[PDB]
Design an enzyme around this catalytic site. Structure first.
Site, mmCIF file in Angstrom:
data_model
loop_
_atom_site.group_PDB
_atom_site.id
_atom_site.type_symbol
_atom_site.label_atom_id
_atom_site.label_comp_id
_atom_site.label_asym_id
_atom_site.label_seq_id
_atom_site.Cartn_x
_atom_site.Cartn_y
_atom_site.Cartn_z
ATOM 1 C CB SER A 112 -43.144 -14.695 -10.337
ATOM 2 O OG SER A 112 -43.013 -13.590 -11.193
ATOM 3 C CG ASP A 165 -37.924 -15.548 -15.954
ATOM 4 O OD1 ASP A 165 -38.841 -15.019 -16.611
ATOM 5 O OD2 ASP A 165 -38.097 -15.992 -14.802
ATOM 6 C CG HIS A 196 -41.581 -16.841 -15.410
ATOM 7 N ND1 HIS A 196 -40.822 -16.122 -14.513
ATOM 8 C CD2 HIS A 196 -42.867 -16.702 -15.013
ATOM 9 C CE1 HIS A 196 -41.616 -15.563 -13.615
ATOM 10 N NE2 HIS A 196 -42.863 -15.897 -13.897
#
Length: 214
Positions: A112, A165, A196
């Site tokens: 991320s 996600d 995620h």
């Protein structure tokens, strides 16, 4: 805090792996140890993002590689903080090269927010091309100004993302992959029926990709 370092015997490669927004450097330690089984001569460096204010969350202070000003546009970030983070990564890369690790055998990885940092470092800032980039459940807001010379086109990249996600849109992840592809970069893509997060299957796929390049 200083970086967590997983050394290796007669290390001849190094992977610098950055955690995501608000996380701890130990977040990826189990992942790193699993991959060291795959790559016994590869050192792993897991730096800690400094604690700073994050606008989009209410201004609260937490580990962050760069301020995120809004949920949309994803491009609304503090680029100066992003560059400071990129410089922290460059300092680690410089140190490894000074120790004799070839640049071709230094690979950056990020999950991320950490992924946005390493993609920026390798393709927008560091002059010397690296051995590769692992981008997990991430995006690359600064790829709007992507302008690669021939030497950076040689950096291989593997993009990974959970198709479910709900934090970083898989489409933003694909957009980073597509921008590099459009510029002649060798890119790979693998998505998984997850959110995620990171999965063991994902780590096995990453190990196989790395084994081919180290």
């Amino acid at each position: 805090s200083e970086p967590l370092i997983l050394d290796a015997p007669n290390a001849d490669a190094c992977i610098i792996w950055l955690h995501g927004l608000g996380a701890d450097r130990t977040d990826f330690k189990p992942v790193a140890e699993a991959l060291q089984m795959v790559l016994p001569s590869t050192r792993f460096i897991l730096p800690q993002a400094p604690s700073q204010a994050v606008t989009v969350n209410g201004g609260w202070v937490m580990p962050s590689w760069y301020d995120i000003l809004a949920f949309s546009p994803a491009r609304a970030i503090d680029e100066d903080q992003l560059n400071a983070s990129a410089d922290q990564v460059i300092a680690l890369i410089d140190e490894q090269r000074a120790k004799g690790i070839a640049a071709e055998r230094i690979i950056l990885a990020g999950f991320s927010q950490g992924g946005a940092v390493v993609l920026h470092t390798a393709f927008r800032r560091y002059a010397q091309p690296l051995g590769g980039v692992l981008a997990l459940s991430t995006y690359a807001p600064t790829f709007d100004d992507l302008a690669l010379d021939e030497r950076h086109k040689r950096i291989p990249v593997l993009h990974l993302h959970g198709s479910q996600d709900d934090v970083v849109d898989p489409a933003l992840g694909r957009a980073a992959h597509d921008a590099l592809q459009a510029q002649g970069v060798e890119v790979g893509w693998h998505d998984y029926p997850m959110g995620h997060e990171v999965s063991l299957e994902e780590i096995h796929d990453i190990g196989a990709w790395l084994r081919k390049r180290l």
